[PDB]
Amino acid sequence: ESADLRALAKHLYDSYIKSFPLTKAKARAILTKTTDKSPFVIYDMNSLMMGEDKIKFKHITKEVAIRIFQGCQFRSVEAVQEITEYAKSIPGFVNLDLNDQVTLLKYGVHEIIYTMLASLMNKDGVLISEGQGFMTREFLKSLRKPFGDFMEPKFEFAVKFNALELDDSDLAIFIAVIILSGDRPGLLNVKPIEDIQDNLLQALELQLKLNHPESSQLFAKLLQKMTDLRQIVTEHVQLLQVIKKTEHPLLQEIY
Amino acid sequence: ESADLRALAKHLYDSYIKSFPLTKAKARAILTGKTTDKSPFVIYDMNSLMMGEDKIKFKKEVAIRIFQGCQFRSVEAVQEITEYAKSIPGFVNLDLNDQVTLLKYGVHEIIYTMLASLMNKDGVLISEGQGFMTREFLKSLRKPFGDFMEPKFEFAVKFNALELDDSDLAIFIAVIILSGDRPGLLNVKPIEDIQDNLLQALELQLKLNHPESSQLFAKLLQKMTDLRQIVTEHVQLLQVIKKTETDMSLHPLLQEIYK
Numbered sequence: 338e339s340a341d342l343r344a345l346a347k348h349l350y351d352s353y354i355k356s357f358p359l360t361k362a363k364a365r366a367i368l369t370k371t372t373d374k375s376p377f378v379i380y381d382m383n384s385l386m387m388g389e390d391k392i393k394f395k396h397i398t399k400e401v402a403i404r405i406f407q408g409c410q411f412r413s414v415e416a417v418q419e420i421t422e423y424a425k426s427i428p429g430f431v432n433l434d435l436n437d438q439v440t441l442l443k444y445g446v447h448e449i450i451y452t453m454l455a456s457l458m459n460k461d462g463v464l465i466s467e468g469q470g471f472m473t474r475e476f477l478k479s480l481r482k483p484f485g486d487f488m489e490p491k492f493e494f495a496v497k498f499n500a501l502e503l504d505d506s507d508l509a510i511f512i513a514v515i516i517l518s519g520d521r522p523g524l525l526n527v528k529p530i531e532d533i534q535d536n537l538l539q540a541l542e543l544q545l546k547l548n549h550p551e552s553s554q555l556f557a558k559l560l561q562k563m564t565d566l567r568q569i570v571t572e573h574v575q576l577l578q579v580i581k582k583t584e585h586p587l588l589q590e591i592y
Numbered sequence: 593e594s595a596d597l598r599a600l601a602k603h604l605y606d607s608y609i610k611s612f613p614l615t616k617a618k619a620r621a622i623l624t625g626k627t628t629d630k631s632p633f634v635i636y637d638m639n640s641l642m643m644g645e646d647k648i649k650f651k652k653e654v655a656i657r658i659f660q661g662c663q664f665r666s667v668e669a670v671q672e673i674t675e676y677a678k679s680i681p682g683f684v685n686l687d688l689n690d691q692v693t694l695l696k697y698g699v700h701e702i703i704y705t706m707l708a709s710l711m712n713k714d715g716v717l718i719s720e721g722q723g724f725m726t727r728e729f730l731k732s733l734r735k736p737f738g739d740f741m742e743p744k745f746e747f748a749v750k751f752n753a754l755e756l757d758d759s760d761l762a763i764f765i766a767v768i769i770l771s772g773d774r775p776g777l778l779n780v781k782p783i784e785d786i787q788d789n790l791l792q793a794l795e796l797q798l799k800l801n802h803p804e805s806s807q808l809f810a811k812l813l814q815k816m817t818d819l820r821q822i823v824t825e826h827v828q829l830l831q832v833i834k835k836t837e838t839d840m841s842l843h844p845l846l847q848e849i850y851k
């Protein structure tokens with residue numbers, strides 16, 4: 338009851354904090370008050386360089402649009418690990434069948450990645466490199482044939498997701514819910530997964546009603562965003578199927 | 593007040609009864625063939641199919657004929673849903689183009705929600721319950737047509753496990769129509785205001801009608817995700833058919849819906 342749910346919410350929030358470096362509270366302040374370490378801004382082809390020499394980019398080893406895609410892959414691999422480690426703090430997650438843990442992570446990370454990408458996006462761009470940088474939405478659409486429409490649909494999703502004004506303590510439970518789905522293809526013991534998600538869902542409801550007592554039916558609106566999230570992932574993989582018709586060995590292995 | 597949501601629950605339920613002639617209650621009573629109140633005739637092959645006219649109201653190869661008569665039912669369901677929508681409070685007050693956008697995008701999502709009420713894992717009622725067409729028979733039909741109903745069965749089997757009755761669905765169907773995220777809406781905010789009320793009424797309803805079913809509300813909303821994928825598979829499958837058989841006509845209403 339209240340105490341029990343509110344303890345898990347606290348637990349998940351604490352865990353969410355130390356698993357994820359760039360929190361939403363942090364990214365929003367960096368974004369459109371707390372002006373003290375304003376980030377470098379990539380708004381066009383000329384500011385993309387310099388940036389390279391000014392940011393501590395870790396993926397540079399060749400077209401501009403491909404090298405931005407590849408940088409987005411590197412970052413995705415990092416977040417998989419951060420998500421993986423957060424997953425392991427969700428009560429009951431590690432006690433599940435190991436194959437099921439792997440399946441849940443496998444089919445969940447993309448959904449979680451775009452959820453949290455929203456936290457770093459406004460309608461004019463997205464933070465990059467732990468917030469030391471900013472890539473404008475306009476510069477991204479202007480990129481080559483298949484690449485210019487890779488991150489527009491995430492921008493579109495983010496504006497409608499951020500309009501819910503969740504905070505991290507909201508997002509922590511929300512992400513738990515996503516991982517502990519239960520309809521992921523090929524699960525062996527759905528019952529403990531759904532059991533856990535049921536718990537997480539209960540904790541999310543309470544969390545939203547206390548943290549947003551004036552946002553009516555917010556729980557239901559948040560859950561409704563899962564349909565947009567899955568269509569986004571579904572559309573994302575198809576543009577990946579076209580990229581395998583455009584372009585390392587050991588590096589191609591890492592992805 | 594709870595009491596206003598309950599009255600909205602009753603209103604929508606009563607209008608569901610009036611616009612949908614084959615309820616889930618009727619369908620369940622037919623499907624559980626332990627009630628000889630009128631049992632269905634069962635189509636499972638070419639020969640049962642051909643006998644299916646001497647015995648059922650039944651107005652080109654086998655696959656065509658089956659999906660020509662499924663097109664009829666589909667446009668007829670569009671009208672029934674369309675009639676149900678006008679009964680949702682506030683719906684007819686919205687901008688006319690919004691009204692048209694809501695039906696455009698909600699209608700198939702509702703057709704497969706309600707198709708589950710006609711389905712068990714084994715097959716689906718047809719011709720207003722008089723008939724029953726097995727899942728295997730549908731899955732066996734020619735290269736493109738056979739790939740059509742199987743994803744509805746898969747959804748229906750899971751969705752049916754929620755054990756919703758007609759009063760639950762009436763509210764759920766109303767929430768789907770009044771989304772607000774549909775592409776191209778002019779006044780999103782009055783749509784969300786109604787759906788906000790619809791969602792409140794659904795939540796209370798599930799809590800009251802299914803007291804032991806924890807988080808059935810949330811679980812039901814998650815299902816909204818399965819619906820939209822099915823629309824997408826179906827549509828892209830529909831695009832294969834118009835190129836395979838250029839002699840075959842999709843009904844104009846359903847054409848207009850698909851964009």
Ligand SMILES: O=C(O)[C@H](Cc1ccc(-c2ccccc2)cc1)Oc1ccc(-c2ccccc2)cc1
Nearest residue numbers: 659660662663665666703716717718840841842846
């Ligand atoms: O897209 C639509 O509106 C419908 C949705 C649908 C509606 C009803 C059923 C149904 C199927 C069996 C029994 C009862 C109902 C199945 C699907 O799906 C259709 C699929 C194929 C057709 C079609 C029409 C003419 C020629 C070929 C295919 C029409 C509709």
